[PDB]
Design an enzyme around this catalytic site. Structure first.
Site, short mmCIF file in Angstrom:
data_model
loop_
_atom_site.label_atom_id
_atom_site.label_comp_id
_atom_site.label_asym_id
_atom_site.label_seq_id
_atom_site.Cartn_x
_atom_site.Cartn_y
_atom_site.Cartn_z
N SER A 158 0.94 -1.06 0.03
CA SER A 158 0.04 0.00 0.02
C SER A 158 0.65 1.32 -0.11
O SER A 158 1.32 1.43 -1.04
CB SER A 158 -0.97 0.11 1.15
OG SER A 158 -1.91 1.19 1.08
N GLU A 217 -9.11 -3.90 -4.02
CA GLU A 217 -8.51 -3.00 -3.51
C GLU A 217 -9.50 -1.71 -3.00
O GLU A 217 -9.24 -1.19 -1.79
CB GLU A 217 -7.64 -2.39 -4.41
CG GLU A 217 -6.39 -3.39 -4.93
CD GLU A 217 -5.46 -3.88 -4.02
OE1 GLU A 217 -5.56 -3.80 -2.82
OE2 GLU A 217 -4.19 -4.17 -4.34
N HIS A 257 -8.17 -5.02 0.39
CA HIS A 257 -7.06 -4.37 0.43
C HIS A 257 -5.92 -4.41 1.79
O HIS A 257 -6.68 -4.48 2.84
CB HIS A 257 -7.17 -2.91 0.55
CG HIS A 257 -5.94 -1.69 0.31
ND1 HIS A 257 -4.87 -2.16 -0.61
CD2 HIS A 257 -5.57 -0.65 0.93
CE1 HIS A 257 -4.05 -1.06 -0.56
NE2 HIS A 257 -4.37 -0.25 0.40
P1 LIG Z 1 -2.37 1.80 2.23
O1 LIG Z 1 -1.20 2.27 3.12
C1 LIG Z 1 -3.35 3.15 1.32
C2 LIG Z 1 -2.70 3.91 0.41
C3 LIG Z 1 -3.67 5.05 -0.12
C4 LIG Z 1 -3.21 5.94 -1.56
C5 LIG Z 1 -3.97 7.15 -1.94
C6 LIG Z 1 -3.32 7.76 -3.09
O2 LIG Z 1 -3.34 0.79 3.27
C7 LIG Z 1 -3.16 0.52 4.59
C8 LIG Z 1 -2.51 -0.57 4.71
C9 LIG Z 1 -2.38 -0.98 6.34
C10 LIG Z 1 -1.36 -2.13 6.52
C11 LIG Z 1 -4.00 -1.33 6.68
C12 LIG Z 1 -4.83 -0.17 6.24
C13 LIG Z 1 -4.83 0.31 4.88
C14 LIG Z 1 -5.45 1.55 4.62
C15 LIG Z 1 -4.92 2.82 5.12
C16 LIG Z 1 -7.00 1.75 5.06
#
Ligand SMILES: *[P@@](=O)(CCCCCC)O[C@@H]1C[C@H](C)CC[C@H]1C(C)C
Ligand SMILES: *[C@@H]1O[C@H](CO)[C@@H](O[C@@H]2O[C@H](CO)[C@@H](O)[C@H](O)[C@H]2NC(C)=O)[C@H](O)[C@H]1NC(C)=O
Ligand SMILES: *[C@@H]1O[C@H](CO)[C@@H](O)[C@H](O)[C@H]1NC(C)=O
Ligand SMILES: [Ca+2]
Ligand SMILES: [Ca+2]
Length: 534
Positions: free
Chosen positions: A209, A341, A449
């Site tokens: 992520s 996702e 996700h």
């Molecule tokens: P990522 O870090 C979300 C990135 C968003 C990008 C937009 C341009 O997802 C997270 C990963 C962690 C392990 C758990 C929650 C999850 C989200 C923040 C909901």
């Protein structure tokens, strides 16, 4: 018991956890406190001689995921939990949080030259820490496979503390501080990993992520120059959900708004130099002011308040353009996604139920998109509930008439189709791609996700074959096929290539498939990428 002798001659002690040896909480930088706030990290200069490193340090300050300038129940509830003494005991956070963690197979000695897997956590660029991502499953499987590796993880500043933007931040040269924390950790591994038994020339970076979008940013950093002292900082990358960041410049429109909002919140609206005012406020006022700006779970969703933004210095331009223009490091890469996702982010706009509301939500999210483009998008991703995410579930998961729709869009732009765009333009090295459908049938969220974190660090499943084994063979040999899986992972050349190009995962195991779905959404989104930047 475990011991290492750093580059500067210091000698530290770690913890022998039986199944591995760990060196937790090693400071790699001076505390980014006081007037060092929002600024580039300063290398740590001090002595660690004779010091014990047997526990993770505190994570950097966290932002309330449900934060926003509005007042509501989930905001209230999470704040109640986050400020609790119980929570602060079990999960301590601090501005002095720039530490690094090294974990190795038991018995490892300096000179072993084991491949290194440097983990970059993902927490929506607003929360997160290294302590929640257990390296034990990885390390153990690597030993069992006869391909032992060293797991390294680095803390980095998140939310306002690490990703503040705006005119002032640009002028000062302080953009993307959190990514710089990550970059210093890398330089630290280059200089010190040998003392732990790892080979600095065999570093594979990987995250999920936000950690994944981070790996992309490092590939694009300094127009592709990933060297330190004349040697590359890493020979490969594994991106689990996330390619380029769809963001405008640091002195852009939303970067500037957020900055201003945060300033008013901290009581710096009247300051002639709001930045200085911000360095002066206590941690409590800053923590408070940040929680009054939108968190990732708030209605704003994907349109994050804090995230990597092109600065024209270390990330010289639009991230999609850098990729089209060949300004990246030439390294072999594995990059994949989870089938669903967007279902997580789709939960943030469940008060949108009619097509009229859907069009306006998108309009508020993508300020650079013309009505015509909004219309094209809403044709590629129709109201038909059978067509949305959770994909292939028919008329189920109809929380609202627009939920599955909004989820299909957000997950595609932010991750899934974003990936295909990288893949179609990237010629830096061999590419490998996967798509998970391991959790097909899971109500509401589907193969959601971050579920990969579970199968990579917590539980075993068909997915761990990729998340552990295949990821291990790649870090060791630069080819995931050396893992010895029963299904060969084919090389990805283009989404228009004939033949299976994706590694797929279901509850039972692995199979191969094609990356040709939702082509209409792809052109709606990426015909002119900047129309959809935040
Ligand atoms: P990522 O870090 C979300 C990135 C968003 C990008 C937009 C341009 O997802 C997270 C990963 C962690 C392990 C758990 C929650 C999850 C989200 C923040 C909901
Ligand atoms: C869904 O809820 C959101 C969040 O409250 C609504 O947006 C807010 O509306 C208030 C006024 O009601 C504004 O002052 C806020 O600025 C809005 N917040 C954000 C983050 O934009 C939104 O209008 C509702 N959507 C629908 C379709 O009803
Ligand atoms: C950012 O860019 C400048 C100019 O190219 C360079 O000197 C600097 O070292 C870069 N920062 C990092 C963290 O690499
Ligand atoms: Ca301003
Ligand atoms: Ca090039």
């Amino acid at each position: 018991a475990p011991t290492a002798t750093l580059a500067n001659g210091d000698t530290i002690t770690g913890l022998n956890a039986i199944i591995n040896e760990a060196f937790l909480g090693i400071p790699f930088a001076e505390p980014p406190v006081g007037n060092l706030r929002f600024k580039d990290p300063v290398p740590y200069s001090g002595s660690l001689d004779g010091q014990k490193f047997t526990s993770y340090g505190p994570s950097c300050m966290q932002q309330n995921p449900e934060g926003t300038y509005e007042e509501n129940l989930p905001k209230a509830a999470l704040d109640l939990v986050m400020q609790s003494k119980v929570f602060e005991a079990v999960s301590p956070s601090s501005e002095d949080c720039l530490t690094i963690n090294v974990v190795r197979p038991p018995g490892t000695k300096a000179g072993a030259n084991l491949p290194v897997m440097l983990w970059i956590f993902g927490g929506g660029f607003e929360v997160g820490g290294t302590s929640t991502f257990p390296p034990a499953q990885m390390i153990t499987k690597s030993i069992a496979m006869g391909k032992p590796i060293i797991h390294v993880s680095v803390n980095y500043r998140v939310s306002s503390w690490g990703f503040l933007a705006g005119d002032e931040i640009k002028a000062e040269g302080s953009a993307n501080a959190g990514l710089k924390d990550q970059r210093l950790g890398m330089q630290w591994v280059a200089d010190n990993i040998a003392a732990f038994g790892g080979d600095p020339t065999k570093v594979t970076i990987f995250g999920e992520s936000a950690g994944s979008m981070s790996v992309m940013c490092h590939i694009l950093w300094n127009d592709g120059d990933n060297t330190y002292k004349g040697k590359p900082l890493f020979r490969a990358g594994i991106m689990q959900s996330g390619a380029m960041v769809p963001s405008d410049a640091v002195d852009g429109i939303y970067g500037n708004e957020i900055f201003d909002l945060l300033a008013s919140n901290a009581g710096c609206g009247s300051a002639s130099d709001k930045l200085a005012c911000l360095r002066g406020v206590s941690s409590d006022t800053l923590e408070d002011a940040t929680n009054n700006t939108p968190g990732f779970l708030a209605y704003s969703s994907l349109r994050l308040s804090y995230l990597p933004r092109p600065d024209g210095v270390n990330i010289t331009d639009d991230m999609y353009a850098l990729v089209r223009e060949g300004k990246y490091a030439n390294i072999p890469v594995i990059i994949g996604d989870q089938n669903d996702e967007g279902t997580f982010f789709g939960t943030s706009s469940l008060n949108v139920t009619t097509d009229a509301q859907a069009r306006e939500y998108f309009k508020q999210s993508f300020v650079h998109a013309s009505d015509a483009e909004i219309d094209t998008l809403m044709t590629a991703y129709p109201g038909d509930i059978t067509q949305g995410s959770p994909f292939d579930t028919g008329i189920l998961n109809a929380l609202t008439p627009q939920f599955k729709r909004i989820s299909a869009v957000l997950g595609d732009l932010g991750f899934t189709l974003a990936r295909r765009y990288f893949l179609n333009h990237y010629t830096g090295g061999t590419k490998y791609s996967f798509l998970s459908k391991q959790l097909s049938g899971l109500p509401v969220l589907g193969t959601f996700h971050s579920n990969d974190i579970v199968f990579q660090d917590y539980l075993l499943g068909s997915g761990s074959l990729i998340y552990n084994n295949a990821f291990i063979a790649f870090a060791t040999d630069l080819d995931p096929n050396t893992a010895g899986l029963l299904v060969k992972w084919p090389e990805y050349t283009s989404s228009s290539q004939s033949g299976n190009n994706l590694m797929m995962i279901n509850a039972l195991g692995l199979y191969t498939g094609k990356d040709n779905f939702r082509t209409a959404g792809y052109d709606a989104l990426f015909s002119n990428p900047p129309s959809f930047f935040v």
